[PDB]
Amino acid sequence: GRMHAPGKGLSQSALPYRRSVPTWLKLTSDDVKEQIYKLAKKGLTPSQIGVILRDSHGVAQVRFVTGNKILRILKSKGLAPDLPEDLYHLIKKAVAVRKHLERNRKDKDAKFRLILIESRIHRLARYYKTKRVLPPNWKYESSTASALV
Amino acid sequence: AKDLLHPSPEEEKRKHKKKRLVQSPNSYFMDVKCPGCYKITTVFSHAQTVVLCVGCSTVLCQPTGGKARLTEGCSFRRKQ
Amino acid sequence: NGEKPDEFESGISQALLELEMNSDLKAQLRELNITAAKEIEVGGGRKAIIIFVPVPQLKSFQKIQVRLVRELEKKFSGKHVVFIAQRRILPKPTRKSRTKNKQKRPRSRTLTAVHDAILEDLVFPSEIVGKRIRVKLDGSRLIKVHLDKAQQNNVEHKVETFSGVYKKLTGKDVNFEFPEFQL
Amino acid sequence: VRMNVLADALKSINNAEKRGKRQVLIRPCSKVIVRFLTVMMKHGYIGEFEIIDDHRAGKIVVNLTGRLNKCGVISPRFDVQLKDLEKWQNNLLPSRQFGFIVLTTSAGIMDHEEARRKHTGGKILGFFF
Amino acid sequence: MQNDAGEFVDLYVPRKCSASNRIIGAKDHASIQMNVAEVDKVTGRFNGQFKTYAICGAIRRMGESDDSILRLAKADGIVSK
Amino acid sequence: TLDEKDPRRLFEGNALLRRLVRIGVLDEGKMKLDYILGLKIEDFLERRLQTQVFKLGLAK
RNA sequence: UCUCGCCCGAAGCGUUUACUUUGAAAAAAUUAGAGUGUUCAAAGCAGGCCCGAGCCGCCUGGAUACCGCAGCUAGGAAUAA
RNA sequence: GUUAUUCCCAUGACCCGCCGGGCAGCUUCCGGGAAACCAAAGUCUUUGGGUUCCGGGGGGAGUAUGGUUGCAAAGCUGAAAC
Ligand SMILES: [Mg+2]
Numbered sequence: 142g143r144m145h146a147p148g149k150g151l152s153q154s155a156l157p158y159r160r161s162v163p164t165w166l167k168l169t170s171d172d173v174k175e176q177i178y179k180l181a182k183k184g185l186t187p188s189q190i191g192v193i194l195r196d197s198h199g200v201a202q203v204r205f206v207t208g209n210k211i212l213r214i215l216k217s218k219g220l221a222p223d224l225p226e227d228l229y230h231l232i233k234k235a236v237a238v239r240k241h242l243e244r245n246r247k248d249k250d251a252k253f254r255l256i257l258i259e260s261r262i263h264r265l266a267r268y269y270k271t272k273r274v275l276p277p278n279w280k281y282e283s284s285t286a287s288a289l290v
Numbered sequence: 291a292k293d294l295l296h297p298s299p300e301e302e303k304r305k306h307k308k309k310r311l312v313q314s315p316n317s318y319f320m321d322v323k324c325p326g327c328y329k330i331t332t333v334f335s336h337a338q339t340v341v342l343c344v345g346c347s348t349v350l351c352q353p354t355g356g357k358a359r360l361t362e363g364c365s366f367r368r369k370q
Numbered sequence: 371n372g373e374k375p376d377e378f379e380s381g382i383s384q385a386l387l388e389l390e391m392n393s394d395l396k397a398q399l400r401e402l403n404i405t406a407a408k409e410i411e412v413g414g415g416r417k418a419i420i421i422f423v424p425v426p427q428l429k430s431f432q433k434i435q436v437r438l439v440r441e442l443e444k445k446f447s448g449k450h451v452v453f454i455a456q457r458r459i460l461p462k463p464t465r466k467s468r469t470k471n472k473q474k475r476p477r478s479r480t481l482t483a484v485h486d487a488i489l490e491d492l493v494f495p496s497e498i499v500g501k502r503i504r505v506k507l508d509g510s511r512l513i514k515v516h517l518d519k520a521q522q523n524n525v526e527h528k529v530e531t532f533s534g535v536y537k538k539l540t541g542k543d544v545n546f547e548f549p550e551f552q553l
Numbered sequence: 554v555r556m557n558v559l560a561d562a563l564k565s566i567n568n569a570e571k572r573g574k575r576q577v578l579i580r581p582c583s584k585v586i587v588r589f590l591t592v593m594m595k596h597g598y599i600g601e602f603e604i605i606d607d608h609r610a611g612k613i614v615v616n617l618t619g620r621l622n623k624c625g626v627i628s629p630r631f632d633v634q635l636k637d638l639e640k641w642q643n644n645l646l647p648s649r650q651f652g653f654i655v656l657t658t659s660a661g662i663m664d665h666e667e668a669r670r671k672h673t674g675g676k677i678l679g680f681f682f
Numbered sequence: 683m684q685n686d687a688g689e690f691v692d693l694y695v696p697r698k699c700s701a702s703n704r705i706i707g708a709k710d711h712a713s714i715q716m717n718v719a720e721v722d723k724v725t726g727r728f729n730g731q732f733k734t735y736a737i738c739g740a741i742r743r744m745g746e747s748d749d750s751i752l753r754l755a756k757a758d759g760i761v762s763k
Numbered sequence: 764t765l766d767e768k769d770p771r772r773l774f775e776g777n778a779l780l781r782r783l784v785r786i787g788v789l790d791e792g793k794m795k796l797d798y799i800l801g802l803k804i805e806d807f808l809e810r811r812l813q814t815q816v817f818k819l820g821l822a823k
Numbered sequence: 824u825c826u827c828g829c830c831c832g833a834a835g836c837g838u839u840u841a842c843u844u845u846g847a848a849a850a851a852a853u854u855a856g857a858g859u860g861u862u863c864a865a866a867g868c869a870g871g872c873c874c875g876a877g878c879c880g881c882c883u884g885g886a887u888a889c890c891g892c893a894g895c896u897a898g899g900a901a902u903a904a
Numbered sequence: 905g906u907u908a909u910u911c912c913c914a915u916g917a918c919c920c921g922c923c924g925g926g927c928a929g930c931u932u933c934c935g936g937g938a939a940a941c942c943a944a945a946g947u948c949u950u951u952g953g954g955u956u957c958c959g960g961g962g963g964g965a966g967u968a969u970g971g972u973u974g975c976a977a978a979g980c981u982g983a984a985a986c
């Protein structure tokens with residue numbers, strides 16, 4: 142099923158077979174990019190930025206309407222968070238569960254879940270070191286987590 | 291015996307999203323035509339943000355598990 | 371660049387210049403250019419004309435072709451005029467071709483990505499929906515390919531043209547099909 | 554998880570033949586899996602088939618003939634050097650002139666006895682009879 | 683089965699099933715030889731000929747035969763157009 | 764077990780068959796390796812000395 | 824590339840293997856197998872024919888094979904890296 | 905198709921569904937099983953999805969002895985003679 146919890150549900154999304162938008166969404170790639178710079182200036186996730194266009198502004202998958210992907214669009218003129226978002230969110234709760242243990246040093250159900258979240262970090266450190274976007278000197282012990290909220 | 295290549299379009303709506311042969315998803319874009327000032331709003335049906343239009347500046351969709359529902363006197367169609 | 375364009379293309383290349391003369395294509399075809407063309411029989415005696423397109427300039431042949439296919443048919447016979455582009459089909463590096471100090475290869479210049487994108491190009495006014503490689507009981511391959519129902523009668527007669535054109539380009543035995551589009 | 558997807562396919566046909574059905578589905582494809590069925594088509598143990606084009610990785614729908622008793626995969630794909638096939642002839646195929654074995658030779662996917670006409674040989678894909 | 687001398691040694695051809703294409707054995711006593719009659723033209727009178735159906739056992743047990751007869755009559759083309 | 768055009772078969776298969784002719788187990792016709800397989804024990808008991816002595820008389 | 828003497832040599836002189844088939848390379852002995860009536864047989868590498876001496880005598884045999892893995896060369900570019 | 909706020913307006917409450925994953929059930933000659941029984945204990949002499957732990961006649965015995973941990977009670981690893 143999944144990694145650290147045995148659930149074998151199947152909740153996925155599928156792109157249809159159909160290609161770029163037929164009649165509406167009169168919106169160029171230069172016009173998509175100028176909105177999408179405006180969003181990540183306001184400080185949102187690439188997982189949130191895709192949501193913002195998807196509901197509000199009628200936009201489909203950005204791959205069709207631009208020819209490219211929203212992180213490659215993002216890196217073109219330097220708006221990187223420079224610590225990727227898979228590693229960002231899992232740290233963003235790994236700090237909190239350690240903090241929750243600091244006032245409950247008997248909540249061992251939360252202690253076991255820390256092991257699963259510490260498992261997921263050091264696996265994902267191994268992948269990002271392999272694509273060399275995360276350098277080989279990089280580490281993660283305790284306080285690296287703290288200031289990097 | 292059984293058919294795979296030519297099933298019935300009755301059968302395949304019933305089957306799950308990614309379990310049919312073409313796998314095209316079950317959401318749609320809906321044309322919320324609020325009477326606010328002028329604007330026709332294209333908005334995803336299975337939405338997640340409070341879709342606030344820019345002219346009238348009120349709520350057009352509720353975030354709900356499943357699909358959004360509309361607020362008061364908002365009419366829609368599909369763009370196809 | 372070492373070209374001298376021949377007679378039927380000169381009948382073609384004058385026709386575009388005749389279309390930017392005080393019509394709806396003046397500043398348009400002043401920014402639209404030429405590659406090549408061919409003159410191909412399909413069905414016996416009825417010959418389908420096709421032209422070729424520079425690939426970054428395809429969207430000028432794409433967004434504007436419906437009036438433009440009317441115009442060039444007025445100047446050429448009222449026969450079938452279908453539009454495709456200039457695809458550089460690059461082979462894979464075999465071990466004994468060389469390591470020629472070349473680049474990777476892109477997948478807009480490779481064979482599987484090339485000739486599936488011409489099925490895109492031929493049926494422009496209708497989006498393709500689904501191909502089915504029906505494997506006949508031999509070493510032959512049918513391409514049964516679904517088509518849209520919205521502009522269906524627009525690409526009704528074109529299917530008589532299409533199977534003959536796509537065998538000379540590619541070498542594949544197709545069969546365009548009209549079922550419904552299924553949301 | 555999903556590994557050795559030729560073994561995926563050859564359980565689908567096996568469970569549909571012993572159930573006695575008419576036509577089956579195999580949810581991934583490969584040029585491995587296209588050419589392996591192309592071996593079976595040229596010999597005629599199974600009927601026509603037809604590959605539904607998904608833009609990601611398609612599916613295969615096989616009209617069954619009903620000949621097959623067993624369609625298997627050799628699982629690690631042992632390499633085959635020649636004059637070692639008579640060993641696999643005694644081992645796998647039931648009789649002396651029935652069945653075939655599918656080989657991955659230097660010039661493509663071939664047949665059991667077509668391999669020693671080529672006199673090249675190669676790694677295994679499986680067996681059927 | 684014939685050899686290189688073309689010799690008929692082989693005893694009988696067992697009735698291969700209609701749907702399964704499976705061999706009906708000798709001691710498989712749940713086989714069936716179904717026979718549906720021909721009718722004429724406009725008159726609707728009995729032709730003195732017919733068409734023979736043979737089904738095997740595991741089809742017969744699992745209820746599969748009832749799909750097999752009418753579809754083979756459709757594969758004949760004698761029950762629908 | 765070997766291939767048809769196998770020259771190792773063509774020298775070894777023939778010379779074994781010629782050996783069977785020089786004993787006279789076979790006929791001077793059938794020169795195929797399956798006709799070797801059709802043999803038996805009683806040919807060899809005939810071609811022993813006393814039985815060909817029993818076929819050339821004076822054996823009693 | 825015709826720097827060397829329209830085709831040829833040669834010269835710039837290649838991301839690798841794995842795998843596959845050829846090609847080399849090996850010591851015999853032993854084993855499979857050829858040939859030979861050692862009287863047959865286990866053996867062994869023996870012998871076969873003419874010349875009544877008489878021709879300062881003829882002919883063939885003492886093979887073939889598998890020799891793991893590894894290294895080498897030349898063909899094959901499917902699958903797996 | 906009812907019924908609760910006030911009645912369009914939303915959700916409640918049942919009613920007939922179809923989808924997903926879930927604990928279970930009924931029946932079946934799919935076959936498997938030494939059998940009880942099993943929709944997995946099936947797709948197995950028609951034997952090769954990937955992968956970890958393990959049993960090899962009963963006794964002696966997780967015993968003697970070693971190391972190793974435990975404050976201790978004991979744990980892990982583990983024979984042989986006969
Ligand atoms: Mg795990």
Ligand SMILES: [Mg+2]
Nearest residue numbers: 955956957958
């Ligand atoms: Mg385990």
